[PDB]
A paper describes a structure:
The crystal structure and flexibility of RmSBP have been established, but its molecular function is unknown. Recently, radiation damage to the selenomethionine-substituted single-domain substrate-binding domain from Rhodothermus marinus (SeMet-RmSBP) was investigated.
Therefore, the diffraction intensity and radiation damage were not directly comparable, and the diffraction data were collected from a single crystal by rotating it 360°. The diffraction data collected from 1, 2, 3, and 4 X-ray exposures of SeMet-RmSBP crystals were designated Dose I, II, III, and IV, respectively. For the Dose I dataset, images 1–6 were missing. Accordingly, the number of images for Dose I deposited in ZENODO is 354, and the number of images for Dose II, III, and IV was 360. As the X-ray exposure time increased, the negative electron density map at the Se atom site of SeMet concomitantly increased; however, a negative density map for other atoms in SeMet was not observed.
Numbering used by the authors: 27 to 182
The structure:
């Protein structure tokens, strides 16, 4: 319900100064032909380079994440959905741990990720976007809340 471009405009204010972000995308997720071109348009619009690494199985997760970190030096990890591989505990755990140990915040699709260490997720209420934040991790990572959302932010 929060579109990819809305999400990336939020990320710009949540981690100000970010210039490069990595997306781990499940090759078996629905809507690739919509989402992946939208991410490139979101990149041009926000000024944040978006690098996508696609994965189909758990053995692809580690090598594809390392490519995001060493080849592209991304500054955060962004996960857009969790219907399949990215809803499995082992993939979630691996991605949060390795992002965090590289100094990267994780922007995540659901509160399950926050319960495990991701920083921010989002929802769309009748009054618009509302932010859900892992207070402990977000404070450590230097996450900043845009003024418009100061009153529309819940802590896990």
């Amino acid at each position: 319900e929060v579109t990819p471009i809305q999400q990336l405009f939020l990320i710009k204010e949540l981690k100000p100064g970010i210039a490069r972000i990595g997306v781990i995308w499940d090759k078996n997720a629905a809507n690739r032909d919509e989402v992946l071109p939208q991410l490139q348009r979101a990149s041009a619009a926000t000024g944040i380079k978006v690098v996508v690494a696609e994965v189909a199985s758990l053995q692809e997760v580690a090598p594809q994440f390392r490519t995001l970190l060493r080849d592209h030096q991304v500054e955060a990890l962004w996960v857009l959905e969790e219907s399949g591989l990215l809803g499995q505990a082992a993939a979630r755990s691996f991605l949060i741990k390795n992002a965090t140990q590289a100094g990267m915040p994780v922007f995540a699709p659901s509160e399950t990720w926050l319960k495990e260490g991701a920083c921010v997720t989002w929802r769309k209420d009748a009054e618009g976007i509302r932010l859900v934040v892992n207070k402990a991790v977000a404070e450590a990572m230097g996450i900043t809340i845009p003024a418009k959302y100061q009153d529309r932010t819940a802590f896990l």
